[PDB]
Structure 1
Amino acid sequence: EPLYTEQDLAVNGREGFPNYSHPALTVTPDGDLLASYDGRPTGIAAPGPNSILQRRSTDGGRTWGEQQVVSAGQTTAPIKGFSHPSYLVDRETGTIFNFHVYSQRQGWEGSRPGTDPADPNVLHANVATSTDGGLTWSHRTITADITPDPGWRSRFAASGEGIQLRYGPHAGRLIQQYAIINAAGAIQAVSVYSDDHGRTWRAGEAVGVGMSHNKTVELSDGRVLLNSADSARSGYRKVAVSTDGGHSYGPVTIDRDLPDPTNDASIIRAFPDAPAGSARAKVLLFSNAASQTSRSQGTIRMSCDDGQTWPVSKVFQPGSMSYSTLTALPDGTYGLLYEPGTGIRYANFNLAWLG
């Protein structure tokens, strides 16, 4: 019964880019898998004129089509880069979003306050929207929409995959996590969300200190669990929980069950369509580097109690393992798009493999 397959989707130096990074994975409403990541073209510019790329599988992840460009970096001055994709599917409308950085002159650290897309010293937040299953895209810079405090100096959508709430008064809400640098220079986490199917986006209340890229997941009772890397380097993930559909979070604490070397992770519902409060609705899967000292020992953990306990875990990548993102596939198995050091690798496993 156990299933664990893997195949590279992007290898550094092949298919036009010296480096590929920052995986995003999703399943379209029609059932295709989309894998996205950024390509850093040959060059020494930083932030570089990266592109957001995509590959599609129409056979459940077995084979993958040609690498396509979602957002094309501009390699001539004025330089423009697009990186760190996150997919978000509105399963009610069928629309697919791909959030990503839009860089010009400044990266994360160098960005300064401002929301004018024409300002090249701002690290901008973009989102691409597709109503045709990811074939074609329209683009928006949404920095102004998601910067309620002009003191916020910088932001990026955490690469990976966002969510749509299924439960409660905000059912249908689309939620994409961001990390920001606030006025005081702290790194905080904040949910960016839409209650109108992606027509408009806003930021919620930022939370925490020493945060980083972070992810959210809807628990069995509709609470939204936020799970962040810790830029203060505790050796663990940081967690907080929202009771208002991701708008605001309670206190942030380190989660001793989730060792982490300060690196990306993903956390998903194993049964995203399970009804509220059901046993299956309590099941979470988590992927990250379990090593506290390096980006290695990629591990999947499972919780059957809304993330309170993680009684099952298994290493999927003993070696180098940086960013990773999980998605639930229609066939009941799980896709895992991750960085083995050589680019972007796609794995598919089932719960039987987890044991």
Structure 2
Amino acid sequence: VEGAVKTEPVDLFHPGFLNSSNYRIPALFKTKEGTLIASIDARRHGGADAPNNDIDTAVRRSEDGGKTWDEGQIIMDYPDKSSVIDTTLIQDDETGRIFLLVTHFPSKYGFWNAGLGSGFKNIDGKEYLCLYDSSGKEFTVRENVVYDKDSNKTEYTTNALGDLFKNGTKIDNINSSTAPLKAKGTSYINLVYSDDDGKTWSEPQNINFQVKKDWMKFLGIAPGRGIQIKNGEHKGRIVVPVYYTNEKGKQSSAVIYSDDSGKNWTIGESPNDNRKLENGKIINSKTLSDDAPQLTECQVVEMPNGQLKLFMRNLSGYLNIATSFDGGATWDETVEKDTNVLEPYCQLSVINYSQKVDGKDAVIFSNPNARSRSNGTVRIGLINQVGTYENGEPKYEFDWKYNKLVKPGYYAYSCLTELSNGNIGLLYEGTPSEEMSYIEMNLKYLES
């Protein structure tokens, strides 16, 4: 229609960019300064997930609203088929600090073979990363100095990247397939941060000891973005979607969050914890033994009063939505199924939109509207309160009033952002693992 804007796709990542043959897993965010940051997996050996690859994290920035982008940089790169996989972006408005979190695996590990627990051990009241030698003896890293099982200092030290130094000389890396001391083979949550609007990034902080329980096998970032709560008593809380497997391998969503500007993180309960299934069975994420109720990658948005809604990949064929009244610490027992929104078992993106649409608060949603990763569709969901829960909290529901096909053919993972001009930016997998496409759309287009 007249005045509709949908830009022609640009390949923001593609084979050869930064000398990476493949790319997957978009994250896209507009900073407080108005800069766009796009992060992605630079999959170096093909498109496959860990452990069958060597994956680094790449970032591009735009200072002109997505019209032009910088030359990119690799910000995390582990050796020898140790991979960082699945990024997410969020910023603390108070401090201006931008966070990027990602899942990390040592060489040979990935989602399906991750070992149990955090990979840390408590010694005398502090958690220390464990290392193992060829005989299986256990060592700890205490302030980057390696101690043996009898608390004798060894000749080894580490750094935040896992480099392993013998008397100060680098000899290997604890994440490789060859090191004399290796980390536990499991997932780790890494966090890096930027205080200069994404130009430079810290080295990784391994926060597994704060967020990963002893019964979780995988715990990973659910890629895309986080939020910082705007309304109510949890205002300022930084909320990052995640998901994990239990000892039986079954997946449940949750969020990690920080009330102290990213210094410390905690994991909330899953919506699968004390979840009441359709006909009344009660499950929990620690004991879940069936495939059907699994809840996996997810993204979160905030309601007008501060209530959270967690939108989740799942096995029902349709979108599932959980509700939290306590800032992501727990969820209502009922997970809603929205049969207006097909969900083919793929990541989705949902964001708050800053302006009213048709007099209502709104969200913007992106996923493949199909029974496969195709027919990429962007929706505007209007929020309406429809009475209250038994506990008196407002009950909010979405009206998917506007729905627009933006990508015929292949469409997999995606990430939205609102732009400074009020339009919507979208970075999406329009190929399995090669070109990642960026478009800008206005509301007139989305409503057409």
Structure 1 and Structure 2 fold alike (TM over 0.5) = yes
Write the letter of the residue equivalent to 1:144: F
Superposition map of 1:161-240 within 5 A: 161-208=225-272, 209-230=293-314, 233-240=315-322
Please name the residue that 2:42 is paired with. Answer: 39
- The question of whether the paired residues in 1 share the 8 Å contact of 2:222 and 2:299 is answered with yes
- Aligned pair in 2 of structure 1 residues 339, 114: CA closer, same or farther (>3 Å)? same
Please name the residue that 2:139 is paired with. Answer: none
Range that drifts further, 43-52 or 99-108: 43-52
Write the letter of the residue equivalent to 1:83: I
Please name the residue that 2:368 is paired with. Answer: 289
- The question of whether the paired residues in 2 share the 8 Å contact of 1:303 and 1:312 is answered with yes
Aligned residues: 343
Q: Spell out, residue by residue over 1:305-347, the C-alpha distance to the aligned partner (whole angstroms, 9 max, x if none).
A: 1552111100110110000111111111111111000331111
Q: Secondary structure at the match of 1:308?
A: strand
Is 1:64 aligned to 2:69, yes or no?
yes
1:8 CA drift (Å): 1.0
1:47 CA drift (Å): 4.3
Range that drifts further, 6-15 or 183-192: 6-15
- The question of whether the paired residues in 1 share the 8 Å contact of 2:115 and 2:184 is answered with no
Please name the residue that 1:83 is paired with. Answer: 85
Is 1:146 aligned to 2:211, yes or no?
yes
Q: Distance in 2 between matches of 1:173 and 1:279?
A: 28
Q: Spell out, residue by residue over 1:239-289, the C-alpha distance to the aligned partner (whole angstroms, 9 max, x if none).
A: 1110111111112232212111110111111117x8xxx955x20110000
Please name the residue that 2:286 is paired with. Answer: none
Q: Distance in 2 between matches of 1:63 and 1:352?
A: 23
Please name the residue that 2:11 is paired with. Answer: 8
Please name the residue that 1:299 is paired with. Answer: 377
Please name the residue that 1:131 is paired with. Answer: 195
Q: Distance in 1 between matches of 2:362 and 2:349?
A: 14
- The question of whether the paired residues in 2 share the 8 Å contact of 1:50 and 1:82 is answered with yes
Please name the residue that 1:334 is paired with. Answer: 424
Please name the residue that 1:265 is paired with. Answer: 348
- The question of whether the paired residues in 1 share the 8 Å contact of 2:18 and 2:73 is answered with no
Q: Distance in 2 between matches of 1:265 and 1:198?
A: 25
- The question of whether the paired residues in 2 share the 8 Å contact of 1:279 and 1:304 is answered with no
1:41 CA drift (Å): 0.8
Q: 2:326 aligns with which of 221, 224, 244?
A: 244
Q: Secondary structure at the match of 2:84?
A: strand
Please name the residue that 1:103 is paired with. Answer: 105
Q: Distance in 1 between matches of 2:52 and 2:337?
A: 31
- The question of whether the paired residues in 1 share the 8 Å contact of 2:42 and 2:55 is answered with yes
TM value normalised by structure 2 = 0.74
Q: Secondary structure at the match of 2:18?
A: coil
What is the aligned-residue RMSD (CA, Å)?
1.8
Q: Distance in 2 between matches of 1:47 and 1:173?
A: 36
Q: Spell out, residue by residue over 1:127-159, the C-alpha distance to the aligned partner (whole angstroms, 9 max, x if none).
A: 111111112222211111112x31011111111
1:221 CA drift (Å): 2.1
Q: Spell out, residue by residue over 1:290-310, the C-alpha distance to the aligned partner (whole angstroms, 9 max, x if none).
A: 012x10000011111155211
- The question of whether the paired residues in 1 share the 8 Å contact of 2:51 and 2:83 is answered with no
Please name the residue that 1:29 is paired with. Answer: 32
Q: Distance in 1 between matches of 2:220 and 2:193?
A: 17
Q: Secondary structure at the match of 1:15?
A: helix
Q: Distance in 1 between matches of 2:184 and 2:335?
A: 33
Write the letter of the residue equivalent to 1:186: K
Identity, in percent, stands at 31
Q: Secondary structure at the match of 1:254?
A: strand
1:126 CA drift (Å): 0.8
TM value normalised by structure 1 = 0.92
Is 1:255 aligned to 2:255, yes or no?
no
Range that drifts further, 162-171 or 208-217: 208-217
- Aligned pair in 2 of structure 1 residues 244, 42: CA closer, same or farther (>3 Å)? same
1:173 CA drift (Å): 0.5
Q: Give 1 or 2 for the bigger CA radius of gyration.
A: 2
Q: Distance in 2 between matches of 1:120 and 1:81?
A: 14
Please name the residue that 1:17 is paired with. Answer: 20
